[PDB]
Amino acid sequence: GFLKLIEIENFKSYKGRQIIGPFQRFTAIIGPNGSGKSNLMDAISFVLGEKTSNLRVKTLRDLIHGAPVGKPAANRAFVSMVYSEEGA
DNA sequence: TTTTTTTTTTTTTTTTTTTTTTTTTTTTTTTTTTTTTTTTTTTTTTTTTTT
């Protein structure tokens, strides 16, 4: 199979629920500086698992959107992909 | 004009100092080990809350 698309919620400067579009065979993630694009990869490394120290943030509580600034939004987060393999 | 006297420059000798080079010794930062402590994370029971 391959990596179809993912799903974000409140994790690291992505407020609300929005669906990352379907991925073609070979895509790219462009954007100007400081826009916050590395954090999608951070999300990918968090669904598939990576020790927290490698996630360039201490304590795992400033993960929620807006916490490193000083004001959280909720007490949840939800990141999720949808793997699509042969067999329908 | 020639002879006699003075002074400056050039060059060699020497002596003291400086530099160099190696060698041997020493003592120091560097590198590795072990420990071990902290802190973050985890769990599980307790507590709180909801139907």
Ligand SMILES: Nc1ncnc2c1ncn2[C@@H]1O[C@H](COP(=O)(O)OP(=O)(O)NP(=O)(O)O)[C@@H](O)[C@H]1O
């Ligand atoms: N949970 C959060 N909520 C809101 N903002 C955040 C959060 N975490 C980090 N940020 C900020 O949002 C930005 C995201 O940083 P980061 O994801 O590293 O961006 P980037 O993708 O590396 N930028 P760039 O390479 O220049 O395109 C930075 O300014 C962070 O300080």
